[PDB]
Symmetry: C2
Subunit: 472 residues, 2 copies
């Protein structure tokens, strides 16, 4: 049905561009430096590029028939790595649904607190808004699959116009947009933001919050039967969408670092508008001292800038409330693409009976065999993780499970190309199995640097599932 642009490239660019593009890129260039945000984006692009090569080698190992990213992995490689990846990835998308709707609810709550609508506290309005938007997304996943492929191009032309709106707002200079940060492209602010601050966080804890902005590269491989030719659509879409989103992340990082200060008092200075006595840097005025804390703690007695407000891409963009309100489009599109692909892999795993007490989640109800017990279990896991209503503590879990799945893929293709499996002839031009080994080692090492006990628990679960399906 689909080609390669509308089927793989648009779906990967909608699954990748999620929460951290708008509401957490500027906080990453505020915590880490520009030279560290570039290293963060280049590392999370190297990881996803190696995993994209490794899944294109699976998608070019024959097997045109059969939809689902579980099917290509369990047919090309063994059923052990297939079952392990089809459980870890179907848990990673089920918790990524919670991440994207927590980011959406946080955006809605931080829009309504600027207005008069504030019912309960900030960490309890997200638990209310995030609950309603996950039962409205469950209904649109079980009764609105025919409009999703029609509305994906509308969501993409919302999203690309939102990014271009942010950029063409970043080139202009408005003095009313000052006191929230956002002076013009200044080499003083560019030199000040060049270099880390790490207020509260650290490197490989800013990377852990970044890395779910790089996940979603298996949105092309998850639909194989929907495509026309999976030998030419899945590499050419994934390894192009990864490059496009990496360049957009690098450009957004440099644009947010080169024109926004790290802290800014939310009060206009019309008395003494030009202040240069005892000046340090970035002085068009406004006297942005006394917001940087004297103590080295996590506290910062300010309300705007790159460090505090979480939402400064609204005031940098030319028109915030509708055009830069493509935060909603990105979050709901990524949560929709992760809500119809977490039971899909799970239904494909429960049909081929592998795990004992799991085959009850395979009865696909409805007309198109949509798995309702898979949808309800994904909804249960998602609603179990919405209740921790803070994106900065959901994201080191999504990063952990997606690094586990992307280490398992890059290790399974290396083990297949090393053990010389009979049905593993990887007819792809740039595969180079030692690069997939280096990618798997890098994913495991970064997953352990982020959070060592969760990484140890996830690797013990992966080894237990592998030694179970091996000696079944």
């Amino acid at each position: 049905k689909f080609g390669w642009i509308k089927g793989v490239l648009v779906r990967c660019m909608l699954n990748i561009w999620g929460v951290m593009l708008f509401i957490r890129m500027t906080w990453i260039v505020g915590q880490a430096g520009i030279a560290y945000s570039c290293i963060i984006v280049i590392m999370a692009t190297v990881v996803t590029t190696i995993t994209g090569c490794s899944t294109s080698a699976i998608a070019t190992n024959g097997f045109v028939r059969g939809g689902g990213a579980y099917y290509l992995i369990s047919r090309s490689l063994g059923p052990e790595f297939g079952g392990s990846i089809g459980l870890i990835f179907a848990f990673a998308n089920a918790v990524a649904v919670a991440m994207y709707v927590v980011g959406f609810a946080e955006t809605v709550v931080e829009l309504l607190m600027d207005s008069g609508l504030l019912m309960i506290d900030q960490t309890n309005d997200i638990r209310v808004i995030g609950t309603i938007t996950v039962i409205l997304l469950l209904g649109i996943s079980v009764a609105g699959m025919e409009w999703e492929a029609k509305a994906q191009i509308f969501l993409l032309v919302i999203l690309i116009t939102a990014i271009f709106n942010y950029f063409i707002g970043s080139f202009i200079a408005v003095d009313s947009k000052k006191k929230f940060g956002f002076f013009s492209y200044d080499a003083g602010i560019l030199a000040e933001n060049f270099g880390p601050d790490f207020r509260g966080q650290t490197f490989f804890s800013v990377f852990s919050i970044f890395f779910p902005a790089a996940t979603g590269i298996l949105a092309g491989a998850n639909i194989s039967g929907d495509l026309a030719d999976p030998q030419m659509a899945i590499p050419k879409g994934t390894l192009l969408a990864i490059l496009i989103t990496g360049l957009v992340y690098v450009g957004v990082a440099i644009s947010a670092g080169a024109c926004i200060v790290r802290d800014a008092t939310g009060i206009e200075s019309n008395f003494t508008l030009i202040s240069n006595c005892t000046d340090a840097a970035c002085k068009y005025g406004y006297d942005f001292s006394s917001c940087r804390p004297t103590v080295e703690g996590e506290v910062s007695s300010c309300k705007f800038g790159l460090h505090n407000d979480f939402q400064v891409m609204s005031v940098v963009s030319g028109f915030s409330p509708l055009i830069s309100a493509g935060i909603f489009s990105a979050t709901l599109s990524s949560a929709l693409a992760s809500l119809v692909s977490a039971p899909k892999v799970f239904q494909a795993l429960c049909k081929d009976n592998i795990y004992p007490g799991i085959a009850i989640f395979g009865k696909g109800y409805g007309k198109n065999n949509e798995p309702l017990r898979g949808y309800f279990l994904t909804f249960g896991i998602a609603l179990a993780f919405i209740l921790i209503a803070e994106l900065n503590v959901i994201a080191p879990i999504i990063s952990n499970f997606f690094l586990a799945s992307y280490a398992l893929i890059n290790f399974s293709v290396f083990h297949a190309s090393l053990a010389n499996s009979p049905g593993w002839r990887p007819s792809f031009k740039y595969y180079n199995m030692w690069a997939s080994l280096a990618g798997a080692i890098l994913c495991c090492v970064v997953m352990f640097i982020i959070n060592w006990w969760a990484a140890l628990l996830t690797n013990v679960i992966v080894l237990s599932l592998y030694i179970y399906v091996s000696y079944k």
Copy 2:
């Protein structure tokens, strides 16, 4: 052909009773509580008991003739697990030689600092004494193998005389032995020490310095050709020596906590002997306040007690300088039993050619085919760790590698009894493969709790050495 007592039980009780019995047990009951020291000894005894059951299942899987240490593991299980255990264990003993001679050199250096002999600073006299005692132990390992099996019983009666001397000195009460700690058995100091302090260290960092006191349980399974029947000597000796040394460690920990204060200044107090007011503990006098630090750091302005002097088992003992000088016997006997067993496993691994650039170290010289290249490589690996002249930073490495080896054994027997290997008939009464799975998961978790990056490095080395030998 030895029996089962003087070939397995004596060798295991000499390899297990190493450094941490005399010079680092009172510091463990000073850092942790009495209850936490008992939990530490019981956890290490559980780990070594599960590994003793798992190596008894290997030593009772036939294979009487052609005995060895690498031989039983490589011939009952596969060569893939044997060729990795025979490198991790042969590196663990090669670095344990450095640990035992660093403990011996530290004992010699502190005995010379109690006298007037002092050449250079304290962290450089250990680098001098530790280098001389590792080139003298190399000559004994290549020349004096005939005297070793006849002097092991003499070293054992020295060691048991030292333990009984410590105990019968602990029951008596001497007024002159006060101000170094060591009041008599009383419930006040027992209630004071029942509870953690953790000055500088933490739990699973006091356990990491403890756990080399439990290692050495494979000294019975390292000489199988030197035994009459390995089916009855190795299970009945290992799991008896582990119980004996665990009861001795529990008794020494309780007898060190129930009569020694945690802090005691070396100033005798004749004037104002017995205090009346402002007293919390120590109802005999000497006013041991103001040695506890007001700050919460690792610094302590004191010189004796349980926390500081490192040698208080000389003070508690009846006659220190020759009877409680079994520290030298324990350290040199354990370093000798780890110096003749690190190339022995390595020679047995290099004869069956597995690794490409390793086969040079198999040229056994001498009259009894003792590998001088393996001895020189073990001497080099030990000399690369003697230069780090601090036992509290050597011991979390020995603990890491021995937990890796004891996780690999307890996982190899579980993988053999789960895969139902054709040559794995574990004729042993108390094997129960899920207990070996629990004792492998527990070692893999504790090895990561101690030091996560070294555990990740060791697990990546183990997985590399398993995927290299297995799937090639």
